[PDB]
Amino acid sequence: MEKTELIQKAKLAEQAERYDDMATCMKAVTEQGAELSNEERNLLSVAYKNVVGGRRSAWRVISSIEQKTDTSDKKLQLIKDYREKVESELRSICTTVLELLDKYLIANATNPESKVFYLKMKGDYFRYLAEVACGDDRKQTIDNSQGAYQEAFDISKKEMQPTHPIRLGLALNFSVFYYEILNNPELACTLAKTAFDEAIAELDTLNEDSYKDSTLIMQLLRDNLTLWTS
Amino acid sequence: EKTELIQKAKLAEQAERYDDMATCMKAVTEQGAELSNEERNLLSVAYKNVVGGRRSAWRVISSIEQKTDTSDKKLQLIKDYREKVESELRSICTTVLELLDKYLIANATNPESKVFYLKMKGDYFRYLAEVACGDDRKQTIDNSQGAYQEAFDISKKEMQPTHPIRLGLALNFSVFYYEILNNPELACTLAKTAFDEAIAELDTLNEDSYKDSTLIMQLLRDNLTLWTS
Amino acid sequence: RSSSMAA
Amino acid sequence: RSSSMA
Ligand SMILES: [Mg+2]
Ligand SMILES: [Mg+2]
């Protein structure tokens, strides 16, 4: 199927909340090898975000039930096996996304904005892997997530305005990484705070649409700031 | 393996992994043993959630299809996607109806279970009817209505008007009248009759039964408000 | 849309 | 839970 029809079908699937189909469409689009437009990047990201969020929430539920079950209970084995199944699906999804990022999206990015977007995505999905990682694998997975986040962070500080929604969302997700993966609330707080503060300074120079887009992310930053400082 | 299948079905339910839940309860059903109330509810929840996604997706896709110009070159892709969703929905409904005809209705021992299963048959033939056209639509409507009518007669004969299964049967049968047969007057009368007759004996139900029956009565009144305006 | 049982 | 970008 050609790119135009793939985008049509991806939007149709999005409307139907059939995100597996949407992800398949955007995966084919990406594999066609051309640089994605902002709309196409957004469609890919939405599709895989939902596809992985399903497994993430299911995994949280199952692992919560597991860590609340007596280690001598004969039922524990089934709970653990089911968690492992969900974990395998989650790992497969994240691996597909990271393959798309390495082989196509990062490789062909021709501007710092797309490169920041994709490196942030790499950090995101490595972080999703880190959420469920245990043992030696966890250390390297965390390192991969952090490296992607840090490269994206530096590029965005060099090439983008502090109000750019991509830079702000990168700051948000990086602060989340600090708080949830590295378990360092102070640095996460300072990261979100710095992004927010450096953004308010420039907000008034934007049109109302860019103001809207930036305000949303800044509100998320402040929400996390309030949660973590309590 | 019944106990492990049930544990896994409940676990998948909590994780909202309804395909796994449907597979677990399908295996439990195919074991030939009649299901308990809990197990019936697990099967119903599983397949309700498995088919509801397809139903909502189909409504969205068909809606987008109506608003698409008939000469638009992009129309055939929308049609093909709707047909794909329809095929998935037909597969699900056929699986459920096979479970009903081969195991559940066959081994149902009491009229409560028989009403539950015949109502389920009505529900899934109604889902087929929602997306059918032509002769297939007529046949699916006839099957749905027959299931609903037999369940309704058995429920009037054997069960009190406050029983939540009889009330939910009245609810779904009124929905069938309104949405499939397209007779709002008879749908209203069916819903209102079930509702009114349920009020009297409400003081006899227990906690769970009271909660379920009043929930269904509230749905009946909501449908009555919507249909009459 | 009409409401059916939460089943 | 922390809010990431959606
Ligand atoms: Mg195992
Ligand atoms: Mg058809």
Residue numbers in the entry:
A (entry chain B): 1 to 230
B (entry chain A): 2 to 230
C (entry chain C): 363 to 369
D (entry chain D): 363 to 368
Please, what does the article write about this entry?
The I-BAR domain protein IRSp53 is a key player in these processes, acting as a hub that integrates signaling cues from Rho-GTPases and phosphorylation pathways to initiate cytoskeleton and membrane remodeling events. In the inactive state, the SH3 domain binds intramolecularly to the CRIB-PR domain, resulting in a compact, closed conformation. Here, we show that phosphorylation of two pairs of sites within this region triggers the binding of 14-3-3 to IRSp53, which inhibits membrane binding and the interactions of Cdc42 with the CRIB-PR domain and cytoskeletal effectors with the SH3 domain. In all the structures, the phosphate group on the phosphorylated side chain engages a cluster of basic residues in 14-3-3θ, consisting of K49, R56, and R127, and additionally forms a hydrogen bond with the hydroxyl group of Y128.
Therefore, to study the binding of 14-3-3θ to the pT340/pT360 and pT340/pS366 pairs, we determined five crystal structures, allowing for direct comparisons of the structures of singly- vs. doubly-phosphorylated complexes. All the singly-phosphorylated peptides, except Site 1 (pS325), bound 14-3-3θ with ~1:1 stoichiometry (i.e., two peptides per 14-3-3θ dimer) and relatively low affinities (Kd ranging from 5.5 to 16.5 μM). For the singly-phosphorylated peptides, the electron density is symmetric for the two pockets of 14-3-3θ, even when two-fold symmetry was not imposed during refinement.
